[PDB]
Amino acid sequence: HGFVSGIVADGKYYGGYLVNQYPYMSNPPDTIAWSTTATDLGFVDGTGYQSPDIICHRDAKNGKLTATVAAGSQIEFQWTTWPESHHGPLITYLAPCNGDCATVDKTTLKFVKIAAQGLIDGSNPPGVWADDEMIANNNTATVTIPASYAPGNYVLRHEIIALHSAGNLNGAQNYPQCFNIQITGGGSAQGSGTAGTSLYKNTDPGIKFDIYSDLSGGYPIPGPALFN
Numbered sequence: 001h002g003f004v005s006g007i008v009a010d011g012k013y014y015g016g017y018l019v020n021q022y023p024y025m026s027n028p029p030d031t032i033a034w035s036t037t038a039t040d041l042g043f044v045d046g047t048g049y050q051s052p053d054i055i056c057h058r059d060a061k062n063g064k065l066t067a068t069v070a071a072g073s074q075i076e077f078q079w080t081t082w083p084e085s086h087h088g089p090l091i092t093y094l095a096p097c098n099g100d101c102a103t104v105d106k107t108t109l110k111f112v113k114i115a116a117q118g119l120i121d122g123s124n125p126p127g128v129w130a131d132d133e134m135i136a137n138n139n140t141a142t143v144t145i146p147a148s149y150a151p152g153n154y155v156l157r158h159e160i161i162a163l164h165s166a167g168n169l170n171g172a173q174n175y176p177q178c179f180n181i182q183i184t185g186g187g188s189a190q191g192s193g194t195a196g197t198s199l200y201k202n203t204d205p206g207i208k209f210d211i212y213s214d215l216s217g218g219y220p221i222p223g224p225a226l227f228n
């Protein structure tokens with residue numbers, strides 16, 4: 001359980017969607033981050049992978065602002081202190097808005113995986129994962145926007161999947177957080193994206209996964225193919 005309280009792009013801090021405050025308001029502050037009703041600091045599990053809830057989290061609605069970021073530069077995601085128990089991958093996607101992301105319909109978004117990290121060291125299960133590296137780095141995740149990516153408005157979908165109960169069907173806990181960005185000084189490339197409700201299925205090999213047994217088979221990161 002946790003959320004992203006803010007991000008850093010082009011060296012500028014942007015406050016996130018404060019999920020333990022903003023839902024409890026008629027007129028929450030404008031943010032680059034999508035609103036959600038995930039007030040338990042909870043998650044979407046396999047029972048929701050084909051629901052629109054998986055796209056930007058429960059009941060998500062468009063953020064009203066957008067952050068600029070240079071192609072080839074790093075975005076930092078400041079998570080609220082993440083439990084060491086909740087081992088799992090960090091995955092980050094871009095979907096083009098083909099206009100202002102403040103008025104994109106989330107169900108139309110086609111996400112391209114631009115970064116993913118999984119199991120770092122599984123010699124002693126449950127081992128060391130991408131979220132453990134995040135924790136050690138001042139509870140901050142980092143993602144490079146590809147220098148080749150075309151300039152435009154995109155929803156940036158950053159996600160932890162906690163696998164501590166993922167041996168059970170619908171046991172994995174997905175924590176997606178969305179942000180509106182405008183990539184500047186870009187290239188000409190863009191991936192072929194996947195609809196949010198097509199990213200994951202509950203029987204995927206990296207979803208229904210036992211972190212506590214021998215990990216000599218590694219960990220296949222779920223979701224569609226990583227953009228090169």
Ligand SMILES: [Cu+2]
Nearest residue numbers: 001002083086
């Ligand atoms: Cu939790």
Ligand code: NA
Nearest residue numbers: 084086087132
């Ligand atoms: Na962890």
